[PDB]
PDB file of C-alpha atoms and ligand atoms in Angstrom:
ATOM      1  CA  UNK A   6     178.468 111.085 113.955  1.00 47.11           C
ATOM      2  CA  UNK A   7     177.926 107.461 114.478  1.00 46.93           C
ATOM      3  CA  UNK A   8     174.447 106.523 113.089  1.00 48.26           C
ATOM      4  CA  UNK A   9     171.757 103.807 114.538  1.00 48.27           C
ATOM      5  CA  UNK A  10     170.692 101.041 112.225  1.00 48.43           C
ATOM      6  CA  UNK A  11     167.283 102.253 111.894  1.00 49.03           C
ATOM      7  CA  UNK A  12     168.097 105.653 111.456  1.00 50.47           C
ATOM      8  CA  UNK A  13     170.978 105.420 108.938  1.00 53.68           C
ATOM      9  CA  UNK A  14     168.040 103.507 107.155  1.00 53.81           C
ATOM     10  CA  UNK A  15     165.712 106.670 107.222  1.00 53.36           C
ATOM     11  CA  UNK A  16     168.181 109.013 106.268  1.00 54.09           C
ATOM     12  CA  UNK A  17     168.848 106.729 103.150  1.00 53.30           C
ATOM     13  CA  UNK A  18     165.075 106.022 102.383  1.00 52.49           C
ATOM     14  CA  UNK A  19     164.768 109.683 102.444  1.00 52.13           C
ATOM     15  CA  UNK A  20     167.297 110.800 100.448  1.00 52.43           C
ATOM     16  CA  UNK A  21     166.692 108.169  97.644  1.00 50.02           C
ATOM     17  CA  UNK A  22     168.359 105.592  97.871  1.00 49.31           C
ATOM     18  CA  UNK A  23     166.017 102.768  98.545  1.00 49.07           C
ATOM     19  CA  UNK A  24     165.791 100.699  95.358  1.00 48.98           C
ATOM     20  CA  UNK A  25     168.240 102.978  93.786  1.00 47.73           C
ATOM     21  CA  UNK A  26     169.578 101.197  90.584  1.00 47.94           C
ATOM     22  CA  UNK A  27     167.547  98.048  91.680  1.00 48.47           C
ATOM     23  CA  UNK A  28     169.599  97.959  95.008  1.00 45.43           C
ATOM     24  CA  UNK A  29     167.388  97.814  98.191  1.00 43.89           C
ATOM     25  CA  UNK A  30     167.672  99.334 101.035  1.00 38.73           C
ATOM     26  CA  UNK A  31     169.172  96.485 102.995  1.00 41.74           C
ATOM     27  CA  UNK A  32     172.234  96.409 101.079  1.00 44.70           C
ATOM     28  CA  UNK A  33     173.111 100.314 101.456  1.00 44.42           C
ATOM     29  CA  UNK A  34     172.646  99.645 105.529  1.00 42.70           C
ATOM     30  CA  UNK A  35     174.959  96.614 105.261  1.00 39.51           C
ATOM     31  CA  UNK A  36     177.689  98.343 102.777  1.00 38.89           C
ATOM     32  CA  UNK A  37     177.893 101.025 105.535  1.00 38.18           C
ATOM     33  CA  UNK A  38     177.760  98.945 107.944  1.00 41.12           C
ATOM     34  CA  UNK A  39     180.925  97.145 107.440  1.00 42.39           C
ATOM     35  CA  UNK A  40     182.560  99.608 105.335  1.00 40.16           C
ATOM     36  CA  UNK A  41     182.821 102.301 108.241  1.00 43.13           C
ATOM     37  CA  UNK A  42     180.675 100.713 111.344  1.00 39.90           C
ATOM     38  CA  UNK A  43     177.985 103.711 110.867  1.00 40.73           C
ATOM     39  CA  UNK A  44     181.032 106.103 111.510  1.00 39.66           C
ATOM     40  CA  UNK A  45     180.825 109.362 109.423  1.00 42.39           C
ATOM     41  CA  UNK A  46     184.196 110.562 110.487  1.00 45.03           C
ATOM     42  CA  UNK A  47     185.665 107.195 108.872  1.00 43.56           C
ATOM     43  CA  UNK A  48     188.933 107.380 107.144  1.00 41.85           C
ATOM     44  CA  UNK A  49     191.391 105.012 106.116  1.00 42.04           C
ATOM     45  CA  UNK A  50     194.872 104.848 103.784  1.00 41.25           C
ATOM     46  CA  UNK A  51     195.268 102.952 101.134  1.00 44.91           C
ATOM     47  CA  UNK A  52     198.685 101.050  99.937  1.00 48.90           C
ATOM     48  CA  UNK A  53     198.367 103.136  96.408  1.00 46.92           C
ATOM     49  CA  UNK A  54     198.048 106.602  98.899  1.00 47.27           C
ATOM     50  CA  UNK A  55     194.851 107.132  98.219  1.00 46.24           C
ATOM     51  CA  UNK A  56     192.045 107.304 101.214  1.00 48.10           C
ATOM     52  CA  UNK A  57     188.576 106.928 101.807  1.00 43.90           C
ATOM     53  CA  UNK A  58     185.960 108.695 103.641  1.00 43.31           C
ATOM     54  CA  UNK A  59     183.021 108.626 105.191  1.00 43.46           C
ATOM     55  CA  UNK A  60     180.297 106.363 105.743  1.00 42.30           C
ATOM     56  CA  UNK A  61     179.965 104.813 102.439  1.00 43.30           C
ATOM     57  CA  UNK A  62     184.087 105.056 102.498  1.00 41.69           C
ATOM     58  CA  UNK A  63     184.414 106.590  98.856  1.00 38.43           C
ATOM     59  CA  UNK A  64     188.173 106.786  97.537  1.00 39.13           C
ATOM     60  CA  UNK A  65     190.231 109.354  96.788  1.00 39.32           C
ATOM     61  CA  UNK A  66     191.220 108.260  93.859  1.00 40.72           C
ATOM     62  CA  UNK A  67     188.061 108.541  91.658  1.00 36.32           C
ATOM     63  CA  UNK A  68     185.953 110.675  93.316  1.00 38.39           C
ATOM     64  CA  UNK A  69     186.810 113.369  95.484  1.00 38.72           C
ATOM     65  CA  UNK A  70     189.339 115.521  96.063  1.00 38.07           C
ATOM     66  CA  UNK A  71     191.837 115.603  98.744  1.00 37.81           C
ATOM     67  CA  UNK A  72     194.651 117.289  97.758  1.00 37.14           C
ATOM     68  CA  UNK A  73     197.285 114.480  98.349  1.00 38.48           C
ATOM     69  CA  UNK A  74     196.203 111.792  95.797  1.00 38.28           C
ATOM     70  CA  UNK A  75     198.028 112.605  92.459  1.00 36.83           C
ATOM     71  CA  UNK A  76     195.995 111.765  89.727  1.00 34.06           C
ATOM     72  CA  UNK A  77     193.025 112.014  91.623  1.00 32.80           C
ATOM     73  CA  UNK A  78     190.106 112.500  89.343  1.00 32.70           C
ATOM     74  CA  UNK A  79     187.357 114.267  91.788  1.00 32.26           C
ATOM     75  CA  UNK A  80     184.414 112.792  89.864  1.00 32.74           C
ATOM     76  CA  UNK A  81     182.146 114.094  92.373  1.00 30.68           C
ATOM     77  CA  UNK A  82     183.192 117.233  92.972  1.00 30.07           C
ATOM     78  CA  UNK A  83     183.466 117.573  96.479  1.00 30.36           C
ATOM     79  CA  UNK A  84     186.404 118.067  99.019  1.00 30.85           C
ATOM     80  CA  UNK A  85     186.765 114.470 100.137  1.00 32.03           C
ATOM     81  CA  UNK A  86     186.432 116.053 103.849  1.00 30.56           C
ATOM     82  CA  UNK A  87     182.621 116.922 102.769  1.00 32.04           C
ATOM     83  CA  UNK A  88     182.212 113.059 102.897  1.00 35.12           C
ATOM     84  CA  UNK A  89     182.733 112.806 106.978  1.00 39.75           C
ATOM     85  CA  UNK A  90     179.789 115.650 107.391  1.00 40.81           C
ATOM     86  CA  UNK A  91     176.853 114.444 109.906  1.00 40.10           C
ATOM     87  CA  UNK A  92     174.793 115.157 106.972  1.00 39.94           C
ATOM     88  CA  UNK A  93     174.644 112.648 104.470  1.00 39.80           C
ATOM     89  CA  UNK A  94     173.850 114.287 101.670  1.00 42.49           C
ATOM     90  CA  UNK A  95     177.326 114.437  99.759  1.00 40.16           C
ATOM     91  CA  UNK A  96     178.015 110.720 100.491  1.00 41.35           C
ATOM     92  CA  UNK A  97     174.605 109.673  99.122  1.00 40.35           C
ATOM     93  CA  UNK A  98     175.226 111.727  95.949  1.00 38.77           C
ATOM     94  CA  UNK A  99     178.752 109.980  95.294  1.00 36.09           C
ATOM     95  CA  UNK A 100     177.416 106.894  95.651  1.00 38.29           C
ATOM     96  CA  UNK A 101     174.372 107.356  93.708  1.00 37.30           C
ATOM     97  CA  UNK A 102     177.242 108.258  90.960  1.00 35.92           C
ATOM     98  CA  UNK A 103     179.330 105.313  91.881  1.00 40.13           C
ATOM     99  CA  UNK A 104     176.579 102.667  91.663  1.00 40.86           C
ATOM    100  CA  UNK A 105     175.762 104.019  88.241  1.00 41.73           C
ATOM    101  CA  UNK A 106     179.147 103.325  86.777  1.00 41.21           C
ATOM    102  CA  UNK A 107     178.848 100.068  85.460  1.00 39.07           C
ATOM    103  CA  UNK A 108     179.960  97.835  88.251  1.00 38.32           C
ATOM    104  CA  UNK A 109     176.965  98.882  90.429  1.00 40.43           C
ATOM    105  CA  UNK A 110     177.527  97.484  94.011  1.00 38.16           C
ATOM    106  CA  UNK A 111     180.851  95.276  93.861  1.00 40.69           C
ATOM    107  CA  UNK A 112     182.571  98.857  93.833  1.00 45.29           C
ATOM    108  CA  UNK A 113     182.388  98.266  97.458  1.00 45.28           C
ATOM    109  CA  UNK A 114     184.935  95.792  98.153  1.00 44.56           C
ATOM    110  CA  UNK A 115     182.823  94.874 101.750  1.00 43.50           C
ATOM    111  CA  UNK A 116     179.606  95.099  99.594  1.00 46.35           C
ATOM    112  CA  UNK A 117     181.017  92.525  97.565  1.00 43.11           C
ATOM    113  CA  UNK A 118     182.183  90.278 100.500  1.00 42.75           C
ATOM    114  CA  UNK A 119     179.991  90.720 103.395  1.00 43.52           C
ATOM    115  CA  UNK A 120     176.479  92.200 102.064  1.00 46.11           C
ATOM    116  CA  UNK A 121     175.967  90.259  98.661  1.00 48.19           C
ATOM    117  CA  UNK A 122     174.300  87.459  98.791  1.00 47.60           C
ATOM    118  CA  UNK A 123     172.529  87.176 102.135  1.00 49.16           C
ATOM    119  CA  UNK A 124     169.600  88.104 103.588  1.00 51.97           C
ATOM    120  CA  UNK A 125     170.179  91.939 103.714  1.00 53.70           C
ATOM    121  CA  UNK A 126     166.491  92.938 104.548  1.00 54.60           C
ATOM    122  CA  UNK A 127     167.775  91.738 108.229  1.00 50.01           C
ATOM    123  CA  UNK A 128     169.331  95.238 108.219  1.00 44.63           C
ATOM    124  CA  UNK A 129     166.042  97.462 107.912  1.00 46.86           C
ATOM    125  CA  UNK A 130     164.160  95.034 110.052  1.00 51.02           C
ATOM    126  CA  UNK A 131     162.634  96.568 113.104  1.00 49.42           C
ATOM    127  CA  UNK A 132     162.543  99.889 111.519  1.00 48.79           C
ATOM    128  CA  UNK A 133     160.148 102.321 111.394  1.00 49.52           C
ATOM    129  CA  UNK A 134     160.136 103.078 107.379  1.00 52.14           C
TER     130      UNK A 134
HETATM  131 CL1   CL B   7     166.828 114.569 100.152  1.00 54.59          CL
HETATM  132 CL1   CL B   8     168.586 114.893  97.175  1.00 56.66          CL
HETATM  133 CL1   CL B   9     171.297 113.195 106.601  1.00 55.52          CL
HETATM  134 CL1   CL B  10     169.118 114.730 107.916  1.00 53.99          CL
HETATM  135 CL1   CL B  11     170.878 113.124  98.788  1.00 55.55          CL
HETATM  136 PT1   PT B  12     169.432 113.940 105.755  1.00 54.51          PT
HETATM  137 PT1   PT B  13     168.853 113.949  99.469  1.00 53.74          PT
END
């Protein structure tokens, strides 16, 4: 499913992630925004082999399994396919994982490059919240 702004932002809000770690809800709208253009059915190969899925595009590597990335830890426990459901749920669970890691955010390479440090609130504006 391909999301809306304003409703990606409501299914977020809802499910917790607003302020999540310190993080507001601008800059989960703009991390899925460029990392997968609101696209839940998002994939995309890395050089190392591994992929990543979904909205939030979450890599095989770490945290999920797909059964073609050896060494693959599956730190969320999820079939990486779970991750490109209309539902959000499993994606906002990873990241809520991810973001408490250490590195917060910057695990999100487009986070990092495109989101921090601007005026992210531009993404929820508009919205009924
Ligand atoms: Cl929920
Ligand atoms: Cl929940
Ligand atoms: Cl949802
Ligand atoms: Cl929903
Ligand atoms: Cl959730
Ligand atoms: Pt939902
Ligand atoms: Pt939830």
């Amino acid at each position: 499913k391909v999301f809306g702004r304003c409703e990606l932002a409501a299914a977020m809000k809802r499910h917790g992630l607003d302020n999540y770690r310190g993080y507001s809800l601008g800059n989960w709208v703009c991390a899925a925004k460029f990392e997968s253009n609101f696209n839940t059915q998002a994939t995309n190969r890395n050089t190392d082999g591994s992929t990543d899925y979904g909205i939030l595009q979450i890599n095989s590597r770490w945290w999920c399994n797909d059964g073609r990335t050896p060494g693959s830890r599956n730190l969320c426990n999820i079939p990486c396919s779970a991750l490109l459901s209309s539902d959000i749920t499993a994606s906002v669970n990873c990241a809520k994982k991810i973001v408490s890691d250490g590195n917060g955010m910057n695990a999100w390479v487009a986070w990092r490059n495109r989101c921090k440090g601007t005026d992210v609130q531009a993404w929820i504006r508009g919205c009924r919240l």
